[PDB]
Ligand SMILES: *[C@H](O)[C@H](C[C@@H]1CCNC1=O)NC(=O)[C@H](CC(C)C)NC(=O)OC[C@@H]1CCC(=O)N1CC1CCCCC1
């Protein structure tokens with residue numbers, strides 16, 4: 242029995258109309274054109290012989306408005322440039338007429354968002370990821386994908402949360418919020434950096450076990466229970482995030498009649514081994530589906 | 544090490560501009576508005592007390608142009624109606640000004656395409672699936688999602704290949720090509736139907752093993768080889784599709800120096816068991832990534 246759970250991305254059309262190409266010398270990447278501002282990563286000002294330890298403050302001071310070319314596939318003339326964190330704030334003389342209602346927000350570990358992978362300002366593909374506990378994502382990015390944006394949707398409002406910056410040694414990726422901060426402790430310099438450990442997202446595993454119950458698969462459900470506090474002490478020693486219940490998880494507990502504490506106990510035993518059995522066709526715990534994913538895709542509850 | 548392989552969907556914006564709502568009495572679903580034609584499933588003419596054995600020819604004869612309401616979220620006045628297979632061909636008096644360059648094509652088993660899940664003509668999410676060998680897909684569809692379209696992209700041309708129709712007993716889904724034929728042997732009537740067996744897509748497993756080699760994971764690669772003909776005889780008895788090499792798989796063999804016949808042998812042994820080891824973090828064979836997926840996402844080769 243198929244679970245009905247796919248990696249679901251938002252429709253990207255609203256964001257595709259906001260993507261441009263930002264070129265600064267010998268560097269090209271993607272920018273996000275909202276109103277009169279174009280956001281893009283600041284290492285577009287970096288000469289290829291300086292990516293390892295660049296001086297972005299001196300590079301910015303060296304830049305003029307004629308140093309930035311912005312193109313949409315229209316050409317946008319630049320009249321202002323500023324730098325917030327790892328991001329450039331380019332002011333263009335034309336406001337984007339396709340600008341959607343938008344906010345900026347930072348995504349927390351475990352939460353999912355949609356990514357629009359672009360190259361030379363041309364959207365190539367879209368996909369959805371979960372912010373890993375070590376503030377990376379398991380994305381699909383190649384050379385020139387920087388400036389690709391990640392977002393969630395709330396009604397007609399688009400919450401921009403991620404602008405792609407770099408690929409770590411292990412093949413995962415990270416980027417910046419639109420306040421300029423890189424996610425985690427990473428820096429936009431091409432030097433080897435320490436990567437924090439990854440962890441199972443406990444809340445996302447609980448959501449996934451609820452989806453199995455929602456699909457009739459419930460052999461793991463036993464009357465035994467583990468308190469949230471006892472599970473969290475257990476989680477610290479077993480590479481699991483500590484569990485924080487939400488109203489979306491409560492919705493899953495209500496519809497199923499299975500308490501969170503039962504699934505916490507289930508996770509503790511399933512972590513020792515699936516014993517040959519399978520859950521939704523998987524032999525390992527799944528933490529890539531959020532409670533909102535299970536609520537929306539199985540129950541039509543947004 | 545992360546593989547860089549995500550479930551990648553095309554950007555949906557071009558298709559979102561083609562989605563409308565088609566209502567016919569007490570039935571509503573989604574339609575695809577291209578030029579002066581709106582396509583939608585023909586069970587929009589079905590009264591809810593007739594979904595099990597409907598007479599679509601009599602239902603069509605009973606329909607007039609005033610029986611079809613088409614809305615985009617503009618209202619489209621209907622001036623013609625026809626029925627090809629399981630699909631309605633509604634003629635509207637306004638041509639879609641956002642009509643992209645498009646063809647219709649049928650998708651073969653193993654090949655992937657992008658789906659735009661809509662409800663009441665409003666695009667809600669996008670996701671990519673592979674046509675299963677039994678002509679189903681493991682999608683994410685709820686009540687009212689019928690009329691959602693599946694497509695591939697070749698340049699600026701959109702190849703429409705799937706319009707959602709039904710959910711089988713096992714939770715998988717199927718639909719129709721735009722010639723009117725349902726995929727497989729299914730019929731758009733709400734009666735229980737036989738479902739053909741599913742099979743591993745051999746070509747997609749070979750592509751996935753090449754992606755592991757592309758990521759440095761190659762412990763399964765032994766000098767032992769299995770001819771394509773010997774593997775195909777083996778595949779018929781082991782729920783694998785027969786392997787048909789393509790120029791995209793040849794590209795993978797060239798870049799890696801690993802022959803198809805070695806991976807065919809690898810699949811034969813891996814099918815007996817992974818022996819505790821993992822490939823790209825998986826303990827079972829993966830057939831949900833096509834050679835084009837591995838070519839594009841890992842090698843930038845479209
Ligand atoms: C921007 O388009 C680009 C996107 C990259 C290309 C490959 N996949 C992507 O997602 N980003 C960079 O090339 C980026 C620019 C820097 C100025 C931040 N550098 C980068 O990703 O280089 C590899 C990164 C640099 C830090 C790091 O940990 N890392 C890998 C290590 C591996 C061990 C040697 C040193 C680099």
Ligand SMILES: *[C@H](O)[C@H](C[C@@H]1CCNC1=O)NC(=O)[C@H](CC(C)C)NC(=O)OC[C@@H]1CCC(=O)N1CC1CCCCC1
Pocket residue numbers: 572586589594684685686687688689690708709710711712716730731732733734735736
């Ligand atoms: C159209 O919006 C809708 C989409 C469905 C709703 C649930 N998920 C979807 O993808 N399609 C239908 O409701 C469809 C309409 C029919 C006129 C074709 N009927 C349907 O999917 O019903 C269940 C299907 C009918 C054939 C079949 O095998 N099947 C399940 C069996 C299960 C055993 C009892 C009989 C139905």
